[PDB]
Design an enzyme around this catalytic site. Structure first.
Site, mmCIF file in Angstrom:
data_model
loop_
_atom_site.group_PDB
_atom_site.id
_atom_site.type_symbol
_atom_site.label_atom_id
_atom_site.label_comp_id
_atom_site.label_asym_id
_atom_site.label_seq_id
_atom_site.Cartn_x
_atom_site.Cartn_y
_atom_site.Cartn_z
ATOM 1 N N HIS A 45 0.913 -1.139 0.212
ATOM 2 C CA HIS A 45 -0.081 0.150 -0.040
ATOM 3 C C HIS A 45 0.957 1.205 0.124
ATOM 4 C CE1 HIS A 45 -0.069 0.365 4.594
ATOM 5 N NE2 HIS A 45 -0.170 1.338 4.309
ATOM 6 N N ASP A 89 -0.329 -7.704 1.577
ATOM 7 C CA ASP A 89 0.307 -6.304 1.837
ATOM 8 C C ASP A 89 1.710 -6.359 1.827
ATOM 9 O OD1 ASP A 89 0.258 -3.423 1.719
ATOM 10 O OD2 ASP A 89 -0.539 -3.315 3.685
ATOM 11 N N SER A 182 3.860 2.020 8.407
ATOM 12 C CA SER A 182 3.686 0.900 7.403
ATOM 13 C C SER A 182 4.589 0.495 6.745
ATOM 14 C CB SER A 182 2.480 1.012 6.504
ATOM 15 O OG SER A 182 1.161 1.192 7.380
HETATM 16 C C1 LIG Z 1 -6.027 2.665 8.735
HETATM 17 C C2 LIG Z 1 -5.157 3.608 8.948
HETATM 18 C C3 LIG Z 1 -5.267 4.550 10.494
HETATM 19 C C4 LIG Z 1 -3.744 3.287 8.776
HETATM 20 C C5 LIG Z 1 -2.693 3.442 7.885
HETATM 21 C C6 LIG Z 1 -3.124 4.109 6.408
HETATM 22 C C7 LIG Z 1 -1.960 5.003 5.874
HETATM 23 C C8 LIG Z 1 -0.670 4.834 5.632
HETATM 24 O O1 LIG Z 1 -0.113 3.677 5.911
HETATM 25 C C9 LIG Z 1 -0.038 5.702 4.949
HETATM 26 C C10 LIG Z 1 0.246 5.569 3.429
HETATM 27 C C11 LIG Z 1 -0.758 5.578 2.421
HETATM 28 C C12 LIG Z 1 1.518 6.468 3.079
HETATM 29 N N1 LIG Z 1 -1.143 6.922 5.019
HETATM 30 C C13 LIG Z 1 -2.340 6.411 5.459
HETATM 31 O O2 LIG Z 1 -3.619 6.889 5.528
HETATM 32 C C14 LIG Z 1 -3.443 2.969 5.437
HETATM 33 C C15 LIG Z 1 -3.322 1.563 5.377
HETATM 34 C C16 LIG Z 1 -3.671 0.618 4.734
HETATM 35 C C17 LIG Z 1 -4.109 0.956 3.507
HETATM 36 C C18 LIG Z 1 -4.189 2.407 3.138
HETATM 37 C C19 LIG Z 1 -3.751 3.320 3.897
HETATM 38 N N2 LIG Z 1 -1.671 2.712 7.924
HETATM 39 C C20 LIG Z 1 -1.603 2.365 9.347
HETATM 40 C C21 LIG Z 1 -0.642 1.869 10.144
HETATM 41 C C22 LIG Z 1 -0.804 1.181 11.266
HETATM 42 C C23 LIG Z 1 -1.925 1.581 11.939
HETATM 43 F F1 LIG Z 1 -2.459 1.034 12.974
HETATM 44 C C24 LIG Z 1 -3.185 2.292 11.045
HETATM 45 C C25 LIG Z 1 -2.807 2.527 9.810
#
Ligand code: A1AOZ
Ligand code: ZN
Length: 226
Positions: A45, A89, A182
């Site tokens: 992602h 993922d 992430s």
């Molecule tokens: C659900 C959300 C709160 C979330 C995310 C987002 C997110 C990113 O990873 C970054 C990226 C796209 C640069 N910007 C985002 O909005 C997401 C996850 C999966 C798919 C798309 C977006 N990452 C997390 C990691 C740990 C966690 F506990 C929660 C989350």
């Protein structure tokens, strides 16, 4: 990282900071980790039109000699990655050139064994992500110790699956990975067992991590062919 501590500078030399470009918005940010001198593992992602990797960083706002800013030549997203369920993922980034080995920069190779990790033990995760729901990303690398939970703890994530993913973080604590983290590794006794994937928008643990053992064949296939 929510509820963590500042990492000892350069104590996790495999850590990668990712700046991700898209056509229709500003830069986005993820973590990752160096597994070969020219390959970084991260989350699918976190893909984009182009990506830059910074190795050797602690405070990402202060340029220093340990930094290596490296070009990515190709992105290898898992072919079954699903944007609805978030299954599979995982992504490999091939670097244009091999990184230099220094005190501050080195690989984290996988051991031969790929045993399925059961619930119960404590593991550690690091990243530059948000330190709260309403707080920007951290200037410094942060880390936190989290409990591997039984799969029923993640049931409320309706697309969670125990065979594909780890359930991480005691719900009784605030400690968790969050947005910006992430793609970063979860290490259990010094061995990478998971990758930060997703969680709740309000950051209440547990969160969902990709289970690396399931993808070892795919990782090997990409590495051997490229
Ligand atoms: C659900 C959300 C709160 C979330 C995310 C987002 C997110 C990113 O990873 C970054 C990226 C796209 C640069 N910007 C985002 O909005 C997401 C996850 C999966 C798919 C798309 C977006 N990452 C997390 C990691 C740990 C966690 F506990 C929660 C989350
Ligand atoms: Zn330094």
């Amino acid at each position: 990282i929510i509820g963590g501590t500042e990492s000892k500078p350069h104590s996790r030399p495999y850590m990668a900071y990712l700046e991700i470009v898209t056509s229709n918005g500003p830069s986005k940010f993820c973590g990752g980790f160096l597994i070969r001198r020219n390959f970084v593992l991260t989350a699918a992602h976190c893909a984009g039109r182009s990506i830059t990797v910074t190795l050797g960083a602690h405070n990402i706002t202060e340029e220093e000699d340990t930094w290596q800013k490296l070009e990515v030549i190709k992105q290898f997203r898992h072919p079954k990655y699903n944007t609805s369920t978030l299954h599979h993922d995982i992504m490999l980034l091939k670097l244009k050139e091999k990184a230099s080995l220094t005190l501050a920069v080195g690989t984290l190779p996988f051991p031969s064994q790929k045993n399925f990790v059961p619930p119960g033990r404590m593991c550690r995760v690091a990243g530059w992500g948000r330190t709260g729901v309403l707080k920007p990303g951290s200037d410094t690398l942060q880390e936190v110790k989290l409990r591997l939970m039984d799969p029923q703890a993640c049931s409320h994530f309706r697309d969670f699956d125990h065979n594909l993913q780890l359930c991480v973080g005691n719900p009784r604590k605030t400690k968790s990975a969050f947005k910006g983290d992430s793609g970063g590794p979860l290490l259990c006794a010094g061995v990478a067992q998971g990758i930060v994937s997703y969680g709740r928008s309000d950051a209440k643990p547990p969160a969902v991590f990709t289970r690396i053992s399931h993808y070892r064949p795919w990782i090997n296939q990409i590495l051997q062919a490229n």
